[PDB]
């Protein structure tokens, strides 16, 4: 019973340290990818803190199983190196007993990641989107170089103005082009907006309001003669939320309450994805213990990078299977559990290698 507490404490401490380091690294990387865009033409420096503080739970979710993995590896390698594990095994406890002892920290990590997946992360991202839209302000209207072309949402949207007033609004002639995907351009064509001055308004009642002094709307295929031309002096713009579309999909913030009941294959795939993390934690714990057997020749840190790359491959395969599932190509009955089964089989073969070899030795 005492050895149970000893091992549990070492695994928990090492996992905490590894999780902290990994969270720091991932948050920094996302900060680079975000600061590039915020530097070039979009976003504001003041909202990055809120963005990170609201996006952290997903990274913690994707990190905690890996943090436990290495924790297990490092702690049990340290125990093996100093001969504690040998004198333990020289008393009568087997690797099955090791798995039984290690399951409890694994169960705790599974509980935490299950909480994060089911409730905290979707709520966190929903608050991210709502609070972003409410207080965080955008700079595509605030700061522009007049002659510079501004492209929004990659190739779908392009915005250009002849001259922008630094006080914002009361601009010069604007050129707004949007090419919506999903056959919408196929239905009608390409829509372009041209105005004389334009006026930008920021408020709480309306997110962002653009009022033209005099404007025009021409919509039709560039080669085909079917066009719609709309002439007016004023015009509107409302709910512009470029970032939130790029940040997360609409399915990400959907609460788990109505997620399983719905029949949309995307939601069904999301439900299986959210429940994947606890079994992933269990499989990682199962396949971690046999790999922790290291002699002092190869040290303790030798087999950490292979573990990292294996976990990344696991995650990539999960993502690809989820994508093919929500596309509907993969049958829902098989769903996502087959990759977990394959990895569990690999781990089981890894764990039973030595007893099976001894049995083959007659």
């Amino acid at each position: 019973m005492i050895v149970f507490r000893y091992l549990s404490r070492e695994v928990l401490v090492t996992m905490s340290a590894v999780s902290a380091v990994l969270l720091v690294i991932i948050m920094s990387g996302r900060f680079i990818k975000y600061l590039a865009q915020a530097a070039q033409g979009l976003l504001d420096p003041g909202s990055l803190f809120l963005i990170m503080a609201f996006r952290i739970p997903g990274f913690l979710q994707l990190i905690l199983p890996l943090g436990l993995f290495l924790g297990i590896l490092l702690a049990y390698g340290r125990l093996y190196l100093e001969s504690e594990m040998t004198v333990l095994s020289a008393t009568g406890m087997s690797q099955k007993r090791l798995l039984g002892y290690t399951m409890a920290p694994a169960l705790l990590v599974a509980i935490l990641v299950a909480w994060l997946s089911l409730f905290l992360a979707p709520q966190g991202i929903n608050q991210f989107a709502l609070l972003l839209n409410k207080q965080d302000t955008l700079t595509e209207f605030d700061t522009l170089v007049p002659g510079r072309f501004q492209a929004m949402r990659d190739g779908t949207r392009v915005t250009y103005t002849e001259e922008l007033s630094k006080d914002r609004g009361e601009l010069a002639g604007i050129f707004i082009s949007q090419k919506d995907l999903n056959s919408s351009n196929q239905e009608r064509g390409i829509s372009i907006l041209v105005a004389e001055k334009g006026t930008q308004n920021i408020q709480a009642d309306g997110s962002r309001y653009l009022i033209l002094h005099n404007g025009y709307r021409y919509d039709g295929n560039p080669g085909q003669a079917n066009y719609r031309a709309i002439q007016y002096d004023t015009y509107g713009v409302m709910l512009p939320k470029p970032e939130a579309s790029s940040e997360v999909s609409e399915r990400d913030a959907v609460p788990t309450a109505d997620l399983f009941g719905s029949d949309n294959p995307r939601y069904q795939a999301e439900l299986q994805w959210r429940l994947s993390t606890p079994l992933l934690v269990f499989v990682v714990t199962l396949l971690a213990v046999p790999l922790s057997r290291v002699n002092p020749r190869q040290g303790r840190f030798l087999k950490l990078l292979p573990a990292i790359l294996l976990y990344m491959g696991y995650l990539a395969l999960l993502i690809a299977v989820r994508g093919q599932l929500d596309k509907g190509k993969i049958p829902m009955a098989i769903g996502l559990w087959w990759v977990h089964g394959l990895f569990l089989a690999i781990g089981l073969l890894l764990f039973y290698w030595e007893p099976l070899r001894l049995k083959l030795a007659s």
Partner: protein, 130 residues
């Protein structure tokens, strides 16, 4: 939320052949994004090629569905048609829903189609354009 709000809205929609199927004229134009249902109050709608007969529309209240699914006209809409009677004779329509796909002017309310000059009034109204 009102997505698009215009003043002095004039639309010129040239059809694929090159003759304008319809040409919207209005004091104002309104559009919503949360629901793509669109409201267009105080227009003067003209469809010279939308129908074989020249068409003059004067609507006090009007409404257009998402993606042009349906056209809702309210408050005694005056629509003009040119049969052997060459005069436009704007025809009062209390409330109707016009399907742009086949120009099916379904009526949601009783319509008293009365010519401006002469009496052509009809009590009740049943819409079968197809």
């Amino acid at each position: 939320t009102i997505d698009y709000y215009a003043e002095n809205a004039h639309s010129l929609q040239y059809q694929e052949d090159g003759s304008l199927d319809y040409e919207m004229t209005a004091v104002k134009l309104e559009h919503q994004k949360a629901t793509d249902i669109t409201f267009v109050t105080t227009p003067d709608l003209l469809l010279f090629r939308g129908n074989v007969q020249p068409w003059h529309i004067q609507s006090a209240r009007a409404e257009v569905g998402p993606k042009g699914k349906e056209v809702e006209l309210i408050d005694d809409v005056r629509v003009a048609r040119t049969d052997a009677k060459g005069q436009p004779s704007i025809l009062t329509t209390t409330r109707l829903t016009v399907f742009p796909d086949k120009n099916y002017a379904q009526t949601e309310q009783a319509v008293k189609i009365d010519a401006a000059n002469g009496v052509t009034t009809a009590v009740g109204m049943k819409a079968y354009l197809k």
